[PDB]
Design a protein. Structure first.
Length: 485
């Protein structure tokens, strides 16, 4: 029968449930230095420490029922961290470290200490049934009846959920459930722990748990996300809603500054939340690591303006996280050019699929990104068929921009630009070719190149020169004359 040494994370994340359920088995040890560290931390006002000490009490009763020992062991007065102390003891005496912390796993691995990593247990949460259609948040105060904030932003009342107050223990039980649940609900994390306050994101909920010294008793606030302008208030057409529900995973919200992009992004987020999705907001990589650990369904990235932002977006998309990125931009070129060189042409629609422009608080235009293989706009040679991303207007289905590799950078090209070029090559060509039939005309790096065979150069006269210059100034282009071979 094995000796199980429980670390902090074990106590903090419901180890007694695992003993009760038979998932782990053994006689139970806590190092005296962990108990002391928890007592100190509780006295200095930490919420997590009190939850761990509640777990210790829970352990006394479970160990008795499953007929195992429970002992506080080890060297009172040794200099050290409790976790390194617990590890040292196990190295000396042969116990197994029980942990919920990935870091313990690696250290114990390296040191030759056997460990049992607690896999998250699918517990469920008692409180979620207190959320009406009109209930925005939940309020739990020690020696008070539990209350719900019902109504709307700027217009709400508190409504008592029950006629019975809640004792300290009742509030802490709810705290414990929430902390415990952080390990299994997507997108959840412990934000910041201060003396008397613990702030948690549990899926879409914002949780704040307070205690003395900060508040007079044990308190919990749980707030659901609320928006003043819902997605339905933009009156989006069926084609777009359908696309947002069924297809769109890499989304960009564009438009000039001051047009209502943040408001729209928040509205789309909340709508996805109503569809069951967990949606987190970054308000510009620990944010990389924490988000890729928690993996929500969507992340809203508000104000992408630095290389960092664009890299993170790409990374999150490649790890399978949906994105709603907000970019100040007046055109699709401005909206997405910072993306198209980070990945392969073919990969681009795996990064971005939908661009939504916002004009004065309204959706003005939406574009889609779909991969194809084709000959780009204003190019003759079928031999130059290649991967292109077509950027289409959603309303019309019309291809308006193309993305492809020319030379050794990925260009976003308006179809109008390619058309213009081709038309200009032809207008120049028929003028030259009327005099010099063997002359070629081709656009290359900012100039229209007329190549004349050296045998036929005599034919290049002042009449022809004047006409080309007129072509130059009327169309604002550069013509260049070269000689063959």
């Amino acid at each position: 029968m094995n000796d199980l040494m429980l670390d902090k994370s074990a106590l903090l994340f419901g180890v007694s449930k695992y003993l009760e359920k038979g998932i782990i088995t053994g006689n139970v040890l806590i190092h005296k230095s962990l108990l002391a560290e928890l007592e100190r931390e509780s006295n200095d006002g930490l919420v997590s420490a009190e939850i761990a000490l509640d777990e210790v009490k829970k352990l006394k009763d479970i160990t008795e029922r499953i007929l195992v020992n429970f002992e506080i062991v080890g060297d009172d007065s040794k200099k050290g961290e409790a976790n390194e102390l617990s590890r040292e003891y196990c190295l000396e005496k042969g116990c197994i470290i029980v942990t919920a912390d990935e870091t313990q796993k690696k250290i114990c691995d390296a040191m030759g200490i056997q460990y049992n990593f607690l896999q998250p247990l699918k517990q469920g949460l008692s409180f979620e049934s207190f959320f009406d259609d009109e209930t925005m948040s939940l309020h739990i105060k020690e020696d008070t009846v539990p209350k719900a904030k019902k109504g709307k932003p700027g217009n709400w009342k508190f409504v008592n959920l029950s006629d019975k107050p809640m004792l300290s223990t009742d509030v802490r039980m709810i705290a414990n459930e929430i902390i415990n649940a952080v390990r299994l609900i997507k997108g959840s994390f412990v934000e910041i722990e201060r003396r008397g306050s613990l702030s948690i994101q549990l899926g879409n909920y914002a949780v704040v748990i307070t205690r003395p010294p900060l508040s007079d008793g044990w308190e919990i606030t749980i707030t659901r996300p609320v928006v003043r302008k819902r997605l339905e208030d933009y009156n989006l057409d069926e084609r777009l809603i359908k696309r947002l529900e069924e297809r769109a995973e890499g989304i960009i919200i564009a438009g000039a500054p001051g047009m209502g992009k943040t408001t729209f992004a928040q509205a789309l987020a909340e709508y996805y939340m109503r569809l069951g999705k967990i949606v987190k907001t970054i308000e510009s990589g620990e944010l990389h690591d924490i988000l890729l650990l928690s993996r929500p369904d969507y992340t809203v990235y508000d104000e992408m303006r630095n290389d960092e932002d664009f890299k993170l977006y790409v990374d999150l998309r490649l790890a399978g996280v949906g994105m709603v990125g907000v970019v100040h931009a007046t055109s699709p070129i401005d909206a997405i050019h910072r993306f198209v060189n980070r990945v392969d042409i073919g990969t681009i629609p795996n990064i971005l699929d939908t661009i939504i422009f916002i004009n004065s608080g309204n959706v003005s235009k939406v574009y889609t990104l779909e991969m194809t293989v084709k000959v780009p706009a204003g190019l003759k040679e079928a031999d130059l068929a290649r991967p292109v991303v077509e950027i289409k207007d959603l309303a019309t289905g019309n291809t308006e921009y193309e993305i492809y590799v020319f030379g050794e950078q990925t260009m976003i090209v308006p179809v109008n630009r390619g058309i213009t070029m081709s038309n200009m090559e032809f207008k120049i060509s028929k003028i030259v070719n009327n005099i010099i039939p063997n002359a070629t005309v081709k656009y290359e790096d900012g100039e229209y190149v007329i190549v004349i065979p050296k045998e036929e150069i005599g034919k290049y006269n002042r009449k022809l020169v004047q006409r080309l210059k007129r072509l130059e100034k009327k169309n604002n282009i550069k013509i260049k004359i070269k000689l063959s071979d």
